[PDB]
Symmetry: C2
Subunit: 306 residues, 2 copies
């Protein structure tokens, strides 16, 4: 079964680490960065890794029930007992770092918490701005719960609850670090079942990122979130499950109108891209362009400079 990429321009792609469109492509200078995001991780033959699931609506989202109000012990007073995103009960013994979709960054996640009542007063509803701090002592998704704070006090306990992500938030003491994983089991615990760290293994090569500037609810921020593979590619690989014939798939960025190849890159088996370049650089590419699979190669293949 031949490997392939979907035919999608940059404005037809979704970030796999935040529900947002891709804004640009970016290659970053190497500086011993531990790149170990847990969303947007997938092998080329379609094996999802880390906390990666298929739905853009699932990325940085939560589902469960509010079971406690801990006002006066924590600023994030609303205690949310999690289920899986599909509503099945969360199983802490599953060999994953956290429930699928859980945020993989350090900072304030801004969104909306909503409820739809069951029991008496069925289908009464409410929804308000809410913030989840991924550094809070109450951010323990692998243990089965997270907390959020809100300006509104109009939340009901023991009712079905959903958190819809919208953006990030910058506050004093809460800087945003997209490459620092949260502690999924809370303070003084270490993470387990992680998708491995990623890095170029070849001299002169740098990682290529799919970059989004996501919304931010106050503070100075470019809202940058970089993913290794767009969500549509992950969805595509999952469907196709094409066997990887080598550890490296050469891909060509093409202009469909002219037919010209604009540059070439290495698409690695474990699901990331490298290019031959030195220095930070936002790629200057046409709006109609996209990657195409060329051929299987190996680790020793020398990329034409970008």
């Amino acid at each position: 079964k031949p490997f392939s990429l979907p035919i999608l321009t940059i404005s037809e792609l979704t970030n796999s680490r935040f529900p947002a469109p891709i804004d640009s492509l970016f290659t970053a200078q190497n500086n011993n960065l531990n790149v170990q995001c847990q969303n947007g991780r997938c092998t080329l033959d379609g094996e999802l890794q880390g906390t990666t699931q298929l739905l853009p609506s699932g990325i940085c989202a939560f589902r469960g029930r509010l079971t406690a109000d801990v006002d006066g012990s924590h600023d994030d007073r609303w205690h949310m007992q999690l289920t899986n995103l599909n509503g099945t009960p969360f199983d802490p013994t599953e060999d994953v770092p956290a429930p699928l979709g859980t945020p993989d960054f350090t900072g304030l996640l801004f969104g909306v918490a909503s409820q739809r009542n069951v029991g008496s007063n069925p289908n009464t509803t409410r929804a308000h701005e809410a913030v989840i701090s991924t550094t809070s002592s109450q951010f323990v998704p692998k243990l089965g719960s997270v907390n959020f704070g809100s300006t509104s006090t109009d939340f009901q306990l023991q009712q079905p609850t959903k958190f819809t992500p919208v953006g990030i938030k910058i506050e004093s003491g809460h800087e945003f670090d997209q490459w620092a994983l949260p502690r999924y089991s809370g303070h003084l615990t270490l993470n387990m079942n992680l998708a491995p760290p990623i890095a170029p293994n070849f001299p002169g090569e740098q990682l290529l990122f799919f970059r989004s500037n996501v919304p931010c609810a106050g503070g100075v921020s470019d809202g940058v979130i970089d993913c290794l593979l767009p969500q549509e590619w992950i969805q595509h690989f999952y469907q196709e499950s094409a066997p990887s014939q080598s550890d490296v798939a050469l891909i060509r960025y093409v202009n469909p109108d002219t037919g010209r190849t604009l540059f070439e890159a290495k698409l690695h088996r474990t699901g990331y891209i490298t290019v031959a370049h030195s220095g930070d650089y936002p790629l200057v590419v046409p709006s109609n362009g996209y990657f195409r699979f060329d051929s299987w190669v190996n680790q020793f293949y020398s990329l034409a400079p970008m």
Copy 2:
């Protein structure tokens, strides 16, 4: 090129008319309902119709700039001049009903309006709850603008602005009607370039819907939004572009574990499903099940009763 469906269970599908997961399948009694949604419209050979675009993040979303504050003339004081979702300028002469992604229902759309400054004070940001009424006189997306109201007055004019949808809202005088199209060019205008109305053309057959219960920011509502094709199918057809060999594709709902076919349905060329059934009915199907393409048939094919 052989036609096919993606292999996705119900909990791996996204609604094409609101960014939400599919919750259930539902067949509805016939009662001369004008079904003419404009999102989630696509032919089986991959031609998008109405206001349909590819990104779940684009469904019911807006992008543009705030260019006026009309407080004291309209409750929805913030005047948002639209661009296309990919940032290109909106072109009113394009043969579409409205910019791609525009909501196709009557009611209050609840979400978050956010901004990221350009010019001096670059990358300052803000985001607040906001509501868009699709019945407002200021809801004129085909003319190039929409308005929203907000509890916050902290919005800046002439700055890049985005509206992220979260749910619907129920207020007195603003009932929600998922099957009534808004007036894309405003009061006293009629819509143009619409994807056609849909209906069963066969005795004993009813439409099958992919149903979501979406969030709601107050009021009694089941939050039902029904789409004709999930977004992933649309994305799949767009990629494949398999020629339709007839006007009807027989599809089989299957249990992968047992191998059994649970029921059969007609997948029509113009992009909707019918089943043989009489009465409203939420389908009782296993969580692991999904549709598979069987064969091309014609209008005269008689479905096994469901």
